[PDB]
Enzyme design. Sequence first.
Site, mmCIF file in Angstrom:
data_model
loop_
_atom_site.group_PDB
_atom_site.id
_atom_site.type_symbol
_atom_site.label_atom_id
_atom_site.label_comp_id
_atom_site.label_asym_id
_atom_site.label_seq_id
_atom_site.Cartn_x
_atom_site.Cartn_y
_atom_site.Cartn_z
ATOM 1 N N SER A 196 65.620 53.254 30.677
ATOM 2 C CA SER A 196 65.666 54.445 31.513
ATOM 3 C C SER A 196 64.581 55.424 31.070
ATOM 4 C CB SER A 196 67.053 55.083 31.439
ATOM 5 O OG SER A 196 67.295 55.922 32.553
ATOM 6 N N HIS A 201 73.505 50.937 35.589
ATOM 7 C CA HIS A 201 72.419 51.451 34.768
ATOM 8 C C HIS A 201 72.859 51.630 33.319
ATOM 9 C CE1 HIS A 201 68.600 53.496 34.245
ATOM 10 N NE2 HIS A 201 69.192 54.582 33.780
ATOM 11 N N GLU A 205 71.530 49.343 39.695
ATOM 12 C CA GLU A 205 70.912 50.514 39.083
ATOM 13 C C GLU A 205 71.482 51.843 39.576
ATOM 14 O OE1 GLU A 205 68.912 50.801 36.676
ATOM 15 O OE2 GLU A 205 68.060 48.808 36.343
#
Lengths: 533, 535
Positions: free
Chosen positions: A200, A437, A324
Amino acid sequence: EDPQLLVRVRGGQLRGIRLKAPGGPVSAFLGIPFAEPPVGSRRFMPPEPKRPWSGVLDATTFQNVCYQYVDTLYPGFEGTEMWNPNRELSEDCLYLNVWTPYPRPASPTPVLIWIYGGGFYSGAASLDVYDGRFLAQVEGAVLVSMNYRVGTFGFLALPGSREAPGNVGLLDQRLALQWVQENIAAFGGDPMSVTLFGESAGAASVGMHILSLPSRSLFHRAVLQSGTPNGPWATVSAGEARRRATLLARLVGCNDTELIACLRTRPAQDLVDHEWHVLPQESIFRFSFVPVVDGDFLSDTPEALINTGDFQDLQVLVGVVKDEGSYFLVYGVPGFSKDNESLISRAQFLAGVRIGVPQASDLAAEAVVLHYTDWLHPEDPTHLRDAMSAVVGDHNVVCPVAQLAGRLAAQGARVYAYIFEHRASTLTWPLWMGVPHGYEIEFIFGLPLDPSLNYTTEERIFAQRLMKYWTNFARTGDPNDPRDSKSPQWPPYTTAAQQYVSLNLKPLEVRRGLRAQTCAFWNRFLPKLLSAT
Amino acid sequence: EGREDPQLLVRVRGGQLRGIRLKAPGGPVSAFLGIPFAEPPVGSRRFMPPEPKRPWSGVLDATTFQNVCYQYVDTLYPGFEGTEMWNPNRELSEDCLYLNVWTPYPRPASPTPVLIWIYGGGFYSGAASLDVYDGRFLAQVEGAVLVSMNYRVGTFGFLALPGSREAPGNVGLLDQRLALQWVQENIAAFGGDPMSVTLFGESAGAASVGMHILSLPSRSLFHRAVLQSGTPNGPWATVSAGEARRRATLLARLVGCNDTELIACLRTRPAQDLVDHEWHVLPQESIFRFSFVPVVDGDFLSDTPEALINTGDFQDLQVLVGVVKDEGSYFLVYGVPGFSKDNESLISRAQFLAGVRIGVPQASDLAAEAVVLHYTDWLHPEDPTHLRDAMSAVVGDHNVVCPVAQLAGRLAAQGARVYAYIFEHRASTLTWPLWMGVPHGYEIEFIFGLPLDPSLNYTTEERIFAQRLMKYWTNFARTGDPNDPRDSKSPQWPPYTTAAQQYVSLNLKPLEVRRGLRAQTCAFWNRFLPKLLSA
Ligand SMILES: NC(=O)c1cc[n+](CCC[n+]2ccc(/C=N/O)cc2)cc1
Ligand SMILES: NC(=O)c1cc[n+](CCC[n+]2ccc(/C=N/O)cc2)cc1
Ligand SMILES: *[C@@H]1O[C@H](CO)[C@@H](O)[C@H](O)[C@H]1NC(C)=O
Ligand SMILES: *[C@@H]1O[C@H](CO)[C@@H](O)[C@H](O)[C@H]1NC(C)=O
Ligand SMILES: [Br-]
Ligand SMILES: [Br-]
């Protein structure tokens, strides 16, 4: 006094601790200072090298977490708490961690450097999911992780000012990389084989070190998991940074110099309190203080830099998780909750899109909706929900990753690409969120090898495969096992074949095209659509 | 009369007719060919609405096809059967308003449901006397009463100075309507049932059918409609009053010509001279665009077709609609560089972009980019074969498939019973190359049952296939339902609905039901594109 636990770095002497990994011991050196505490007049300033110390510095425990917001959405919920600070908050937080095999490697060993995510507003190298003992024990890796300033402390910028140049959090990471160069040999690490990996915001950070000249000499390979320097959320213009900084200052009662001085007088938690209120729109997957295109650390925009960069000398591993976008929906999109099945209406879907694509003009938002709608079932709440996720995930991670992959491959870089599709047996989030995520990290770091964690053994075997890919990549720039013939092989991502692999319990499967049609909408058409508003 | 076949003498409102006994594969049919339904639209009557045919003395011979309405003749592939089949097969003349009737022989005992064919040809060409429109087979095998009319095409049928008296527009459509009325008054004389009239047409004929649906004065003239590969809505079937006025004045200039005075000058020009210049008035370089078509006059069409289908009530109405597998391929060779019937027409990405501008002539740069981006295969963006097939699809989707999908949807949502199909069988006898697949217009020969003619060389499976199709069509004419009342052992053809969007495949295999007619892509053409252009 265990000689294996005593190291001398340029700054003086350290004492690590011996930890138990399921298959043996590892040397851990936690809370090593790499910078002067960035406190007081140092707030908002570039890091300065840690001054030398007398005696033997205790390196047996994690240091403080950089001062940051703490999630309150689902208090006590394991799913969200696992990302929260697990140490005391403090601006005095510039420390790094090192794991090596026990005993110290006999020969120079490839180094992996983890850079955590957290939207540039949170995170810590001390989280359990970043536990480096498994990779050190099982793969013989030297593993480093640093804390770096987040939120206003790391990224508040008055571009052009002397007292708040911006990007100081990235300078924190760079200083740590330098520290590794100067010191990692003392631990048995090979300064000439350094691989950055991050997820990320951490992935975006890695990306930015790739795109910044001074960082080049500090690493040889990169892994970006679920994040990129390019894309909608990872950077802001000098103008938007200045705008948010001034606004935050106004919000707490505060000529650059005088404004920054006033900011330097506010308790940390005052700044955090107003951090999130400077965003231009109601949004998700969007963060207030992130790296700024300063014409310095970043000489131009990431998109500019990846379009024109020469990436000859480089190997990169990039990839995404299956879902995601889901995680982000519960933090702003009406209709979404971790507690119900989040079945939504077409009206909520349109509403969701304006939030998920906060920059979208009306026509652009309509373009999105029409593209993501399933016209056989334009009102089925299940697809509408999954579509909302896809929109967010694609817009923010998948297509920015597809773009980066393409540009890097096209301009000399060796690139490998994956999609991660296994959902942890131990996941606490609802089924509708799929593989969210951040939930590949625990597998890459090898946590299932810890029996007490209650992963299945297929997962333990899976984690073992992943640690192999990652470390093989670190050793060679090629994730492929040099002993394993037949697998099949993980092919390099190229603009021609566009091959990537699925990571799950089944064996490697080679796919072509990373959401090729949809990312074309995002990467090629959408910009034209907005440039004509 | 006296020594003649007593079964072929018939009287209509205008007088007596002598028809002819024709041989169909399974027996005789009665044919009445070249029956006048209007005064010749010649001289001072050019561009004027048709006047009913004034009664004649004695027995009008109706044993041969009459004149074809004056029109341009295709010259792309001279002598080639694929193009010649559509060309005029009788003398060109402005005196061309005649219609044809086929019926069982001897004629039907009870009132028989009537099928009225309306030919296509981009509103600039066509004729009811073409071999592919031969009604003998539907008449003989299905016992149908079949009627086809000539209607004025090109300038003669559609040149308009909107608002004027001397060139009101849409007179070609008025020709069609006049024939429908003729059927209402006269078809009973042949054993036809005026209370069971089904319109059917293809391409511009289908659009014509669509316009009768949308025009009030036509309501009482028919009961059911089939639209094959054509719609009143879409990018080609109509022009605004402004655009028609623009085209008429330009054509006038090109031939050396106050509305009254301009039109008067046009009426002095030889017909051929108008044909020689009609194609020159199009606003852009294009394909699937025609110079002289129905105009939105606020009269025959009270508003745009788009508006009319959006707000209309369609309860007392059954409609059959459909498309062929490859609506667009035929059009590519008439103006997209890179395309030919004589090679594989593999094209480059550059030719694809150029083709998109031609196939979507109204597109701005952004809209065209949108098209290219949507149709590109981003795994193989440069692949010549995909680009060729994509160019076909762009044209096919934009002009037929999506306007049809659009139409079926509105109709269904608003009271009409709708059946939908896609026709996927490529004739064993097709003379175009394989790359063109199943081209625009090539289901017609099957609907009309030409494969039943032994001397045509169709396969036996094709013969059987044609029989099935004639059944679907005639069943729908009879009942508003293509399904056989008895044979429920055969797969059923579900109505098309907004909810399930079901349609069937028509090919050598048995009916197979599918869902969504290019739903995803047609959402691009029907919903997004309009909004992108207006911006
Ligand atoms: N100050 C800010 O920029 C700020 C912006 C947004 N938020 C909400 C964060 C909501 N969130 C938490 C965790 C994740 C990912 N976990 O893997 C995704 C989203 C918090 C702070
Ligand atoms: N004057 C015109 O409007 C005009 C416009 C275009 N053309 C070229 C027509 C070329 N063409 C002929 C037949 C077909 C379909 N056959 O089934 C498709 C295309 C001829 C005349
Ligand atoms: C096929 O013929 C057309 C028309 O002459 C031409 O434009 C095209 O290049 C040809 N395709 C080939 C030779 O591959
Ligand atoms: C059918 O095939 C025969 C044998 O080749 C040929 O002589 C005849 O001309 C064909 N008929 C038609 C109409 O194509
Ligand atoms: Br968020
Ligand atoms: Br054409």
